[PDB]
């Protein structure tokens, strides 16, 4: 195997490193996996399809302009180069290799397109038409953005966009399911808590956070239980950043944020899908859980779950490992059909006050076709009132003792609107048996005499009843 000769490949430290602080992509390339036959679309502000490092891989069938309602996602050029982000992300996935220009994509033989959908008013219809673009041609969608990262918003896909997610994972990709890769957010300095973003909090999105070059949690990171894994991105000014294609046929070394991590993940997922084109959308999440690596990622919340895997709310299961992903994909056995066990927990509304604990012992649909002994995602779907939402912290403890933070205190969130059947999701109990006692904790983290009521708590378990591995 001959590594790429591109002039900035040496600066792509998260791919070209020799110090074990990288995504282990060369190992996948040397196994023969470069993205050939895979199609990725960037949902963003457009794609410079004539960029010298993108044109060779550009796929019009992976592209559309929802903002102007035409097929051509070319960005709108402005003095401030506002609409450059999609071009930066596209190069991370699939910049051409060995062509003397900039660097390379993770999946440098994949085909790449873009949906121009952020340069205009983003409505539910715009979102749905983007998520549902050509779902039997595009394999993987990469989205780096969501509701405002102001630390006070709770929002997610409205009806058309949620229907697009369920159509995508159900009928997309020949019934194997569209793979939606999502950035978990850039709201760290606002103390944002990313389960309040219904796109990344979805079970249908494969959610990705960031690590700095020196292995730390970047200033912009949001912690939450819905994140699955991590890729490298930017940090402080002594740490390197992401090197990729830029608007006006240029090359940048200063692409940043969690919004630069999701495209790298999408590229790794493209390599993995080349290694086994029959992987379902759920198979892909299982591969990420099993192969991601905590080592050398610094956080104070690493905890071992019930099946022996280390998990963090900043990093999920750790750093994506492309070589390990493609190796495990090759002989992967398709997971069993997804079961869903619905448990209505409360017998009466519960005053929250300063603190509320709800304990319930469940059988996880014992005796029924939705019996789950092997969890995937779990949700606590909560309906509650409270006078100042951001003073709440919410935790969910599984029968195996795994504490998932569903919500951390958000100081800027002054809302009096509470949560209206909000489906807080955790990945941290993946592969655990969910039978037994679950504990929900709701706490007022402020000294204020805050007040409200929990009126509904639905525990929703997804998973299967076969195929478990010995714990790690
Ligand atoms: C009842 C009903 O109909 N509600 C409809 C709502 C419509 C809006 N939704 C949230 C939402 C709102 C938004 C737009 N917002 C404004 C700009 C934000 C930055 C500014 C910096 N920036 C650049 O500068 C680029 N050059 C990037 C963009 C992001 C936030 C985007 C999404 C979204 C959805 C999908 Cl699918 C994929 C993706 Cl990538 C992004 C999602 C929630 C539902
Ligand atoms: C894909 O997986 C399904 C489910 O196990 C199986 O029935 C089918 O034969 C597989 N297809 C290929 C091409 O391997
Ligand atoms: Ca256009
Ligand atoms: Ca190149
Ligand atoms: Ca956020
Ligand atoms: Cl469902
Ligand atoms: Na975001
Ligand atoms: Na997700
Ligand atoms: Na534990
Ligand atoms: Na149990």
Residue pair 364/461 in contact (Cβ under 8 Å)? The answer is yes
C-alpha 308/C-alpha 330 separation (Å) is 24
Q: What are phi and psi of 109, to 5 degrees?
A: -110, 10
Q: Please state, in angstroms and rounded to a whole number, the distance separating the CA atoms of residues 77 and 79.
A: 7
* C-beta of residue 260 within 8 angstroms of C-beta of residue 230: no
Sign of CA dihedral 122, 392, 204, 331: positive
Catalytic residue among 41, 51, 85, 142: 85
User: What CATH number was assigned to the domain covering residues 6-330?
Assistant: 3.40.50.200
Tell me the CA end-to-end span of the chain in Å, nearest whole number: 33
Residues 6+ apart with CB under 8 A from 184: 194, 197, 200, 207, 208, 209, 221, 222, 224, 226, 227, 258
State yes or no: is 85 an active-site residue. Answer: yes
- CA–CA distance from 24 to each of 20, 21, 166, 434 (Å)? 8, 8, 32, 33
Q: What is the pairing mode between strands 350-351 and 374-386?
A: unpaired
Residue 63 is classified by DSSP as -
Ligand 2 pocket: which of 334, 336, 337, 466 to mutate (most atoms <8 Å of CB)?
A: 334
Centroid of ligand 4 to alpha carbon of 9 (angstroms): 8
Q: Establish whether 452 is an annotated binding residue.
A: no
How far is residue 315's CA from residue 213's CA, in Å, rounded to a whole number? 14
Which residues, judged by CB distance below 6 Å to any ligand atom, belong to the binding site of ligand 2?
278, 334
Q: Where are the domains of the chain?
A: 6-330, 333-464
Which ligand is nearest to the Cα of residue 462, counting in written order?
A: 6
Give the other-Cβ count within 10 Å of 107's Cβ.
Answer: 35
CA 172 to chain centre: 18
Alpha helices in 235-312 (DSSP H): 261-275, 281-291
Residue nearest to atom 5 of ligand 2 (CA): 334
296 belongs to the catalytic site: no
Phi, psi of 222 (to 5 degrees): -110, 130
Please state the CATH superfamily assignment of the domain spanning residues 333-464 in this structure: Galactose-binding domain-like (2.60.120.260)
**Whole-angstrom distance, CA of residue 422 vs CA of residue 296:** 34
Tokens of 183: 């950035």
Q: What residue owns the CA closest to ligand 2's atom 4?
A: 334
3-class secondary structure, 266: helix
Question: How many residues in the chain?
Answer: 472
């Amino acid at each position: 195997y001959q590594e790429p000769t591109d002039p900035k490949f040496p600066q792509q430290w998260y791919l070209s490193g020799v110090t074990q602080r990288d995504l282990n992509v060369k190992a996948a390339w040397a196994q023969g996996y470069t993205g050939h036959g895979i199609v990725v679309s960037i949902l963003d502000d457009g794609i410079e399809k004539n960029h010298p490092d993108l044109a060779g891989n550009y796929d019009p069938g992976a592209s559309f302009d929802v903002n102007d309602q035409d097929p051509d996602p070319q960005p709108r050029y402005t003095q401030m180069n506002d609409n450059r982000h999609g071009t930066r992300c596209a190069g991370e996935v699939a910049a051409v290799a060995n062509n003397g220009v900039c660097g390379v994509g993770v999946a440098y033989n994949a085909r790449i397109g873009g949906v121009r959908m952020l340069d205009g008013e983003v409505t539910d219809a715009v979102e749905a038409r983007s998520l549902g673009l050509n779902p039997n041609h595009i394999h993987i969608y990469s989205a780096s953005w969501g509701p405002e990262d102001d630390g006070k918003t709770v929002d997610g896909p409205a009806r058309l966009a949620e229907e697009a997610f369920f159509r995508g994972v159900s009928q997309g990709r020949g019934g194997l399911g569209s793979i939606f890769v999502w950035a978990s957010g850039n709201g760290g300095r606002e103390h944002d808590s990313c389960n309040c973003d219904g796109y990344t909090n979805s079970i249908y999105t494969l959610s990705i956070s960031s690590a700095t070059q020196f292995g730390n949690v970047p200033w912009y990171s949001e912690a939450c239980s819905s994140t699955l894994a991590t890729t490298y991105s930017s940090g402080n000014q002594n740490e390197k950043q992401i090197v990729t294609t830029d608007l006006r046929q240029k090359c940048t070394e200063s692409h940043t944020g969690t919004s630069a991590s999701a495209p790298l993940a999408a590229g790794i997922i493209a390599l993995t899908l080349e290694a086994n084109k029959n992987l379902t959308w759920r198979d892909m999440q299982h591969l990420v859980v099993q192969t991601s690596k905590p080592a050398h990622l610094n956080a104070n919340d690493w905890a071992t779950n019930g099946v022996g895997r280390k998990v963090s709310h900043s990093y999920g299961y750790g750093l994506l490992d492309a070589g390990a992903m493609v190796a495990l994909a090759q002989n992967w056995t398709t997971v069993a059909p997804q079961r869903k066990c619905i448990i209505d927990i409360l017998t009466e509304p519960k005053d929250i006050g300063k603190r509320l604990e709800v304990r319930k012992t469940v059988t996880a649909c014992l005796g029924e076709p939705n019996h789950i002994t092997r969890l995937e995602h779990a949700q606590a779907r909560l309906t509650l009132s409270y006078n100042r939402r951001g003073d709440l912290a919410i935790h969910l403890v599984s029968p195996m003792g795994t504490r998932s933070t569903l919500l951390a205190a958000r100081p800027h969130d002054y809302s009096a609107d509470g949560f209206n059947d909000w489906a807080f999701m955790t990945t941290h109990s993946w592969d655990e048996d969910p039978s037994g006692e679950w504990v929900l904790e709701i706490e007022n983290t402020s000294e204020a005499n805050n007040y409200g009521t929990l009126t509904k708590f639905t525990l929703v378990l997804y998973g299967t009843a076969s195929g478990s591995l010995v714990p790690r």
